[PDB]
């Protein structure tokens, strides 16, 4: 007996096109999304060129419209030069992304004054997301308060961070956050198996106590998002390994396993992979769209999942219970038991749908 879920949304993926297409492209990354029960993705801007101006966004939109198999929205990225320049295209983007710490990314900012300038100039009704680790969470929260608006914190990975956010929420501050599956299902204890290259990710894998703190504070977690960050094995195993894990194909199976163990409920999962993503990023519904999963099927994660060009996975060898059997996207069968059945280009930019524009007061 299969369980029907709504179309799930991953608000944090790296699809590497343009410029890193050996790692992933729109076609392979969205195939990976569909296989993981995800029907809508928000693609991060740290591509090559990065999506930091109108011409780069225009290019990315056409690449996505031609390559994507599921629906999508594209982030703009904040740079040291583009504050106050994105107003005409801002509403066409998923939101604005700030990279506030060292990681795989034209996009580190030099000064908190630059963060302020972005918070002041980006339209107030549109989403802002920050990569903000440890004390940087507190710092960007301060900037959000000085500028009287909200912020969404990406991949929370530490007890320190989740408790800070918890304290902010208790004070009524408008902050939301997401947690990635590797920070719920991997820890320092796995670094021996993974090794130092494969194990590179930002935020880094946490201690057992970090992992336990995220589960204990599930009520504080608004969204799950994969931070699908594909790099090839050669890259992960080489002399200067980039940080990141692929995760679209493994996220839902990992979480369904946790549901079957009673670690969270099916509703808890759907709030975090469907409802809260919709409401935080003002993402539209998808007509005639759903995912059928099998919660009984036990399997072991192989050395690589079928679709991502990353062709490796840090979850290799983990036992899971839960499978994506079928995905229907806008009335077409998109995925069945390992076969993707919609072509590159089937996917659409949800920000161009009338119901996908973010409501605003007349300016």
Ligand X SMILES: NC(=O)N[C@@H](CC(=O)O)C(=O)O
C-alpha 200/C-alpha 255 separation (Å) is 22
Q: Which residues contact 9 (CB under 8 A, 6 or more apart)?
A: 38, 39, 40, 41, 42, 273, 274, 277, 278, 283
Among 16, 23, 69, 131, binds Zn ion (CB under 5 A): 131
For its own copies, the binding residues in 130-189 under the rule CB under 8 A are 134-143, 145-146, 159-160, 163-164, 167-168, 171
Residue 350 binds which of its own copies, ligand X, Zn ion, none (CB < 5-8 A, kind-dependent): none
2 binds, among Zn ion, its own copies, ligand X, none (CB under 5 to 8 A by kind): none
Q: Which of 255, 244, 264 is nearest to 200 (CA)?
A: 244
Tell me which of 25, 227, 249, 349 binds Zn ion, using CB under 5 A: 227
Asked if residue 133 binds Zn ion (CB under 5 A), the reply is no
Residue 58 interaction partner, one of Zn ion, ligand X, its own copies, none, beta carbon < 5-8 Å per kind: none
Give the separation between CA 236 and CA 205, rounded to whole angstroms: 15
Contacts to ligand X from residues 301-340, by CB under 6 A: none
CB neighbours of 348 closer than 8 A, spacing ≥ 6? 65, 68, 71, 72
CA proximity to 151, closest of 164, 160, 159: 164
228 pairs with which residues across the strands?
13
Q: How far is the CB of 141 from its own copies (least distance, A)?
A: 5
Q: CA-CA distance, 63 to 53, in Å (whole number)?
A: 16
Name residues whose C-beta falls within 8 Å of residue 232's C-beta, 6 or more positions apart in sequence. 22, 23, 309, 310, 311, 312
Of 77 and 242, which CB lies nearer to ligand X in the complex structure? 242
Give every strand in the sheet of 38-43, ordered side by side.
8-13, 38-43, 71-74
Our finding on whether 49 is near ligand X (CB under 6 A) is no
Q: Which of residues 118, 183, 202, 272 is near ligand X by CB under 6 A? A: 202
* Residue 76 in the binding site for its own copies (CB under 8 A): no
> Is residue 109 a contact point for ligand X (CB under 6 A)?
no
Quick one: which of 54, 112, 233, 295 contacts its own copies (CB under 8 A)?
Answer: 112
- Count of residues that interact with ligand X, criterion CB under 6 A: 13
The contact set with ligand X (CB under 6 A) reads 14, 46, 103-105, 131, 201-202, 227, 229, 242-244
């Amino acid at each position: 007996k299969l369980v029907r879920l709504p179309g799930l949304i991953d608000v944090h993926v790296h699809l590497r096109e343009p410029g890193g297409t050996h790692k992933e492209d729109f076609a392979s990354g969205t195939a990976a999304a569909l296989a993981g029960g995800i029907t809508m993705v928000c693609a991060m801007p740290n591509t090559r060129p990065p999506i930091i101006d109108a011409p780069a966004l225009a290019l990315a939109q056409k690449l996505a419209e031609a390559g994507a198999r599921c629906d999508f929205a594209l982030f703009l990225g904040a740079s040291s030069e583009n504050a106050g320049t994105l107003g005409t295209v801002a509403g066409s983007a998923a939101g604005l992304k700030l990279y506030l710490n060292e990681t795989f990314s034209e996009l580190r900012l030099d000064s908190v004054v630059q963060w302020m300038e972005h918070f002041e100039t980006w339209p107030s009704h549109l989403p802002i997301v920050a990569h903000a680790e440890q004390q940087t969470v507190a710092a960007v929260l301060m900037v959000a308060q000085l500028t009287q608006r909200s912020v969404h914190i990406s991949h929370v990975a530490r007890k320190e961070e989740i408790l800070l956010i918890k304290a902010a929420k208790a004070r009524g501050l408008p902050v939301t956050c997401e947690v990635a599956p590797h920070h719920l299902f991997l820890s320092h204890d796995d670094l021996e198996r993974l090794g130092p290259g494969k194990g590179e990710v930002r935020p880094e894998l946490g201690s057992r106590q970090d992992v336990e703190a995220l589960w204990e504070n599930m009520a504080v977690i608004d969204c799950f998002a994969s931070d699908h960050a594909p790099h090839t094995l050669e890259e992960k195993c080489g002399s200067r390994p980039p940080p990141g894990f692929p995760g679209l194909e493994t996220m839902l199976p990992l979480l369904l396993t946790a549901v079957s163990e009673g670690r969270l409920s099916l509703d808890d999962l759907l709030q975090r992979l469907h409802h809260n993503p919709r409401r935080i990023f003002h993402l539209p519904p998808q007509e005639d769209t759903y995912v059928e999963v099998d919660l009984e099927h036990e399997w072991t994660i192989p050395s690589h999942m079928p679709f991502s060009k990353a062709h490796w996975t840090p979850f290799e060898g983990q036992k899971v219970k839960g499978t994506v059997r079928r995905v229907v996207l806008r009335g077409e069968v998109a995925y069945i038991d390992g076969q993707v059945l919609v072509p590159p280009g089937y996917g659409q930019d949800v920000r161009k749908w009338p119901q996908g524009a973010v409501p605003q007061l007349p300016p």
